[PDB]
Amino acid sequence: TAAAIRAELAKMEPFFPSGLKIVYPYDTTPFVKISIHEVVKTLVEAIILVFLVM
Amino acid sequence: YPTIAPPAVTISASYPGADAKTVQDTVTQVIEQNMNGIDNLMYMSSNSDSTGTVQITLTFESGTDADIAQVQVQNKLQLAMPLLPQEVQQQGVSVEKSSSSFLMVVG
Amino acid sequence: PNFFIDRPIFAWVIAIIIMLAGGLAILKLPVAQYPTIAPPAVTISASYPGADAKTVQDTVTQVIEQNMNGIDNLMYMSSNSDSTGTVQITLTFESGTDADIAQVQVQNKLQLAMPLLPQEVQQQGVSVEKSSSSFLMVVGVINTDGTMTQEDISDYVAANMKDAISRTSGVGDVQLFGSQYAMRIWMNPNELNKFQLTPVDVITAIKAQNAQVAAGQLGGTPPVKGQQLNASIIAQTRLTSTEEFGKILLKVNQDGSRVLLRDVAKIELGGENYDIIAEFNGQPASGLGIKLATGANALDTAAAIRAELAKMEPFFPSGLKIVYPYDTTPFVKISIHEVVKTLVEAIILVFLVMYLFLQNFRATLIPTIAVPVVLLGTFAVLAAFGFSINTLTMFGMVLAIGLLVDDAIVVVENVERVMAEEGLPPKEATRKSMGQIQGALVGIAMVLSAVFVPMAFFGGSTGAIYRQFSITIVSAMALSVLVALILTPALCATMLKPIAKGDHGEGKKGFFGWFNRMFEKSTHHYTDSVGGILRSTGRYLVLYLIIVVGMAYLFVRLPSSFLPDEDQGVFMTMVQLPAGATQERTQKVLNEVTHYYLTKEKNNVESVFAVNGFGFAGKGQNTGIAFVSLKDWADRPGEENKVEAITMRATRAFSQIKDAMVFAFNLPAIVELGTATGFDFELIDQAGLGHEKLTQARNQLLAEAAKHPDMLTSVRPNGLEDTPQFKIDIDQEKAQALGVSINDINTTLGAAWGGSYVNDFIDRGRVKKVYVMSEAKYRMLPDDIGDWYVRAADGQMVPFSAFSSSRWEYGSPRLERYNGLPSMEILGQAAPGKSTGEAMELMEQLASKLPTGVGYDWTGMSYQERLSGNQAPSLYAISLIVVFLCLAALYESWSIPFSVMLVVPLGVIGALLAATFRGLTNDVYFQVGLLTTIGLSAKNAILIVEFAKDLMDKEGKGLIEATLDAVRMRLRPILMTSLAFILGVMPLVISTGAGSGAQNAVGTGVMGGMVTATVLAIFFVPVFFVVVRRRFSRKNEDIEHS
Amino acid sequence: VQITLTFESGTDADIAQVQVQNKLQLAMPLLPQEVQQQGVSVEKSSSSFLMVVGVINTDGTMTQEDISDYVAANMKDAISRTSGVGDVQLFGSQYAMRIWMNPNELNKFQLTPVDVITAIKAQNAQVAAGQLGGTPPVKGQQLNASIIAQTRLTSTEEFGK
Amino acid sequence: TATGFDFELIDQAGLGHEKLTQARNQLLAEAAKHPDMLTSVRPNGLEDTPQFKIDIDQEKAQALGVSINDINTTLGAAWGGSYVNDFIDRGRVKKVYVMSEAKYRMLPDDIGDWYVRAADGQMVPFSAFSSSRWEYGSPRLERYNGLPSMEILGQAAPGKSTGEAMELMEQLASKLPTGVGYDWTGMSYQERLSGNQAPSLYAISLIVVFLCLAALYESWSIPFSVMLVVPLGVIGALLAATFRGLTNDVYFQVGLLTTIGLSAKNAI
Amino acid sequence: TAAAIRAELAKMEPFFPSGLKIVYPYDTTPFVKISIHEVVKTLVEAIILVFLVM
Amino acid sequence: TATGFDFELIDQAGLGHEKLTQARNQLLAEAAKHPDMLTSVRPNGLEDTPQFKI
């Protein structure tokens, strides 16, 4: 959603006047990315730890 | 998370000037009135602002087809559509598949 | 298949697991009268109060039929245009099409002609409705001391009840017997002529005087700096009372004396409509006709509605008590109760046969315990296919007892006899029997399912019953077979007591066992007969041909049908008053009926519900309706105490001795039956002809439909005849001089003799409508035309009699259209046992005498029944051919299936012989019964044949000798299954109770078919095997390997 | 105006169409009150006409509008109830009451097109009437019948007069 | 909206406009002396603001020759606003608004400065009919299950156990007029269908398990011997839950189940 | 579609006036018939030729 | 159409109809001098007709 929204904005980006900047104050998006990163990392760690025990 | 939360559809109508009790008992309860036999209904809550703008929310059981849920309920409200003032229907009345939480806010 | 027989606790684990999964899956399961059978239809309706037929047909109706262009899965369209102004355009769709979506595209094809529609329609409701035709329940509200009247009850209903007692899910559409309160203002023409005023002035008055108005707010956004007050300006506010409506200013007279609405018109807080009077046993009432939704539960809707209503009781005014008249709910509950009772009786009787054959308790328990696990387990299969425990399914299990006990009994029997043939322990005997009937049982499953599957693939309501049945019994069957492989043998190897070679218990027991002797001897007698007939086969072939011919004959001359008529404890009567009659007289009729029922039928009738102004053929003073409830069947014995004879004597009393036609009767089984051996003729205008042109066409046709003795005479249309229409030509010339405005002339004519929807007020918190109309006496007989005067441009009053040319004419109030053009309906049928298509040919040949612009068409039931039909026997032919081939599969012969299927006639001739004896009909249930009968007969034959073949092939025994021995060994089981079955289905055949016509309709055919099946096949099957086998290679004839 | 909305492939046509139209029945009063009565259509539709059926008269005795009339009167009202059709375009057009104003003869008699508009408007229409014995009648009443009011026109004659 | 719950007060017998509200005041006031249980509890709804009524007298206006349509429309268009038509700004169609100005629509005295041009041509003041006054009125009228009702938002002190705060909101309700009741929505609605579903899940699952073990095996004794091990896996999950300080939520129940899983494996 | 449309029209056929004849300029129907007919022909060709090789 | 495309050139910041139309003139005329890349670049639609203001 954020990628296609980023597209929506970036195609409207070459049409921006003086100092007309974007801000991201309310973002529930990258939290997903980093959360999943840490959970997956945990999974991998479980695997490797199993290997070490074995 | 997955699509966890129940699906709800909301009606909003502009009723300029009018007070709370005016818009609530001419629009709000009057919407939920031909809705006696709603499918997959969890719970129902509709408000009536002092700005005259009504906030009528019908909430459904999760995983019920949003499109289909909207079909049965919007077609249970468009039984009670003349029951709403025909004087409002001039500045747009909107029925929307709607949550309550912003996905993202871009400033 | 074999691996299970050595792990018995594993078997019982599967058993108890699926038995308790069974019971669990039995608890929270939907219960209804029938399943969701009937096709879905959607209707558009628009209100144009006052407007006539030619007006609403040509201002609302036609523009709808013009803007209904782009709907998917559209079958046909049939549109009404009542003289009451309300249009009813019903589109019925392809079966199984998603109702919701069809309705949605239709509704968004409706808002295309919305600004094109009258502005009195645009604000008074246009409705799109998914719709059936029958009320589930009617909840009446009354007052015992008669404190309040009809309109009052109607008010409380529409204010606090018609939405709080319905916070229970499962309702589709209410039609209110009564009307909501409105602000009723009644204009006096003398008191309004006096002050030089018109209805128009009242319109503008109550309009611009009474309203809520857009105000603003103190500190309105955006305010200016420093501002520290924000609050909301209240403006003009809508009204509240009958008081606040009289004191509204119309004009101020010069001297200071004000002119208020209180003066020129009388004002009452009165209902929005006074067209239909809802009278409950003399006592005034108001009702709710609750239609059931397409696909809605039955018993929980009613349980939770009665609970909600009894919980809404602490909100009850003076003497306002609830009554529950039209209730098709407890009939369902009691029906299911009696069907369950039938199950229990069948089970127990089967148990008794089982004991009176095997004579030891722990052996009787073996097929006994087998039954719960097949039933309950089937429920688990049912709870997984997403259908419901109705009548049909439970009846399916009632029939399934026979099948399941058939397989189980066969297994246990062959085991018991094998123990008497070798002497080996339980396990080895079990493996022997299983090894003998493995491919056999798989095959019987295959074939039984091969008779039930091709009935599942047919369409229509019959196909829905067929679906419920097929699924029920097939699932039960697969269950019984997998039980035969897994459950029965594990049971045989264990709990079964072991018997050594050749016991047979002959004369061994005092009380019970004597039978065995009597049985055993007869068996040898029986065998001596079989050989005896295989000795000389010829004569029995002739007798066979005879039997077959008898079957064919008996089958042809048998009455066809669709379903049986049902005494549901609740029926109704319809009332019709002739052209242009009056509410008063119809009220007389309804009260007269209501008297008869609560007078001469006191012991039978419990409550009448006289609803005047509401029929089916149309809306109007001419028609009336009266619902009739009868108390619980516990107090209704006899033949004359039942719905049929009751409506018989009712129609007897209400036809020969009355001035108008009024008929009493009972609703069909479903909610919208196929229209019997007849039809629903749609006569359509195409080339754009008149209304009296089409009416005259209907006259010619209906006159031709009276000119045969070989079809009918004096048949009739179900719809209102031409009512008198009163034309009032305003002459534009004679009016445009006097300075009166045509808009005002019309608006005054309307507002006087029609009515007006102007504004909305706030009664007790609830928004209601504001109505202005004439008064009781100033708008009756035609001379009252004059009494209304139009205030010209200055202030001079012109009478209506100054331009109103008045006259009489004729016009039908019910204006029908079919697919975008004018049309008229004609109900009809054919002579008692006439094929409907033949009547089609006669009516079409009588409609082959019509003027371009007049054509014929078919609608409703007789639409789907018109291009589809003569392929059902082909499908059952498929059943028997597939059975043939499948038997050839499990067997391996293009010849032995001949030998078994030749037995099929012997099963049909008995269902027929049973049908005629009691007097039933070839409906759905008798067709299922027939199928089942063919099934089981074919089973027994299949197994006897199987043993003959296996002996012939794998022990080198010859034809004759092995047929004799197979006959010997597999006779007792045949009788076990058979007797247990007949004695199991017997409780159905002769019972009286809720829907017992159904019970009898299945029972009869099943039983008779079974009787002839067994007690003829057990003498015929060997001859079949013998003569059939004598057409496959010379050598060998009588084999011998070891 | 021709507003074409294209969706992700395989998307269910009906629900998309309605939901779109139920966002169209939001901007309906926002549309001119002269458009709202001149047809708004939402259609599940291909892009190419599947088939075209033409009708002629060899003799000569009629023109486009006549054939087109019989077509749009008896035929172009059913081909949209034969499920699987999106929109028929009549090669021709349906009959209308065509009135063509003479401007000098409209100057002559001190009138405007507006006055003709109001004329044919308020002259030709159906109007809410009533019934003899109107509901609810009073006691003793034994006549119920239907008042006919002004009736819309039919000919070139009834429009001239 | 609030983490934890959405405590829902529901109207049942239709008991007043502020009477029920007074019951709720009683409720939130009774539950306000506990900081050792809950935290930051709040009421959900705008309270009654003062309403400013301005009655036009129809007579005193119909004399002076002013038109009611015009007097109303002018009052509106002055202090409310008007949507009339649409224009075309830079290419995009936008809306057209006409209203009063920053200074002519603030404090009530600006009522006067507006005059209606009568039927002839004389300007009539608002003070010729405008009786003005103050009232009480709630601006936000919200409803729950078809009738007006108002809830109570809140949370709990650090070491957030949700069930104790829920149960506590219910516990200070032991001095309230039944006929005024409690119900659940939002989070603790789903947290309501989570917990009291344990007996259904465990009754179906564990018995089905008993028989399922009983399937490949052949004794009404061995499933006993295996199922007896399950507690020994539970008592440690609990002992871990309380010591660190968590809660019987979803994740802990899944964790529990898994643990039961491994234990049952070993025993098997 | 063509069955229900041509049927729809053919019911309006017994109401057709003087010399009012039909013409079919844009037709995608018989092309289908001949196409499938020739495909079946191809099937047969394959069968018989295969038989010949066999 | 195998080879070919449907170029939708969009105005975003709202500059007019002759701004975009002239841009299209520039593009379609300049992209007509490349035969070694594109072919038959064309407008499919009626060009600006003379409109008669009253």
Ligand SMILES: CCCCCCCCCCCCO[C@@H]1O[C@H](CO)[C@@H](O[C@H]2O[C@H](CO)[C@H](O)[C@H](O)[C@H]2O)[C@@H](O)[C@H]1O
């Ligand atoms: C549970 C209750 C008992 C159920 C079964 C009881 C069976 C009773 C059968 C008695 C009837 C005798 O059966 C009938 O007579 C004799 C039997 O020899 C046969 O007829 C035969 O008679 C003698 C026998 O040598 C001649 O060979 C004759 O040519 C041959 O047709 C058949 O005509 C048979 O149909």
